[PDB]
Design a binder for this molecule. Structure first.
Ligand SMILES: NC(=[NH2+])NCCC[C@H](N)C(=O)O
Ligand SMILES: NC(=[NH2+])NCCC[C@H](N)C(=O)O
Ligand SMILES: NC(=[NH2+])NCCC[C@H](N)C(=O)O
Ligand SMILES: NC(=[NH2+])NCCC[C@H](N)C(=O)O
Ligand SMILES: [Cl-]
Ligand code: NA
Length: 129
């Protein structure tokens, strides 16, 4: 599923991401934009052999099992495929764990490089929320 901007904002809020760990909704929408272009099916292989999955590009190195990342963990206790669903529940639940891990949203390098310190409210501008 490819979400619309405001559509994803609403879904994220419904699943309790808005202001989660102090991060406003615009931060989460901005992260999703640059991670996946709002596409739940997005996958990207990393040079180390891990793969990033879904709307928030969650890494198999630590967070989900894909059966092909040697020495990795599955800290969200989920198949990485579950992170590709049209329903964002699994991705949101896992993202909550990731953002609570100590480094906040810096875990998402794209967030750090493209969203951090910017006018992230623009991402939810005009949305019926
Ligand atoms: N998200 C991470 N911390 N990735 C680190 C890479 C995993 C492992 N250190 C490797 O070299 O293959
Ligand atoms: N048992 C763990 N490794 N927990 C957290 C590890 C995940 C974290 N991204 C790291 O690099 O360490
Ligand atoms: N951890 C991140 N958010 N990285 C952003 C860059 C993603 C890019 N597709 C890559 O190959 O790494
Ligand atoms: N600098 C940016 N590209 N911000 C995101 C803009 C999102 C959308 N076009 C809005 O203003 O509601
Ligand atoms: Cl933080
Ligand atoms: Na894994």
């Amino acid at each position: 599923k490819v979400f619309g901007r405001c559509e994803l904002a609403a879904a994220m809020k419904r699943h309790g991401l808005d202001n989660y760990r102090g991060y406003s909704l615009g931060n989460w929408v901005c992260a999703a934009k640059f991670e996946s272009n709002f596409n739940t099916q997005a996958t990207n292989r990393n040079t180390d052999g891990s793969t990033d999955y879904g709307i928030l590009q969650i890494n198999s190195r630590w967070w989900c099992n894909d059966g092909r990342t040697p020495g990795s963990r599955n800290l969200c206790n989920i198949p990485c495929s579950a992170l590709l669903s049209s329903d964002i529940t699994a991705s949101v639940n896992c993202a909550k764990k990731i953002v609570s891990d100590g480094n906040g949203m810096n875990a998402w390098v794209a967030w750090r490089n493209r969203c951090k310190g910017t006018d992230v409210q623009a991402w939810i501008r005009g949305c019926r929320l």
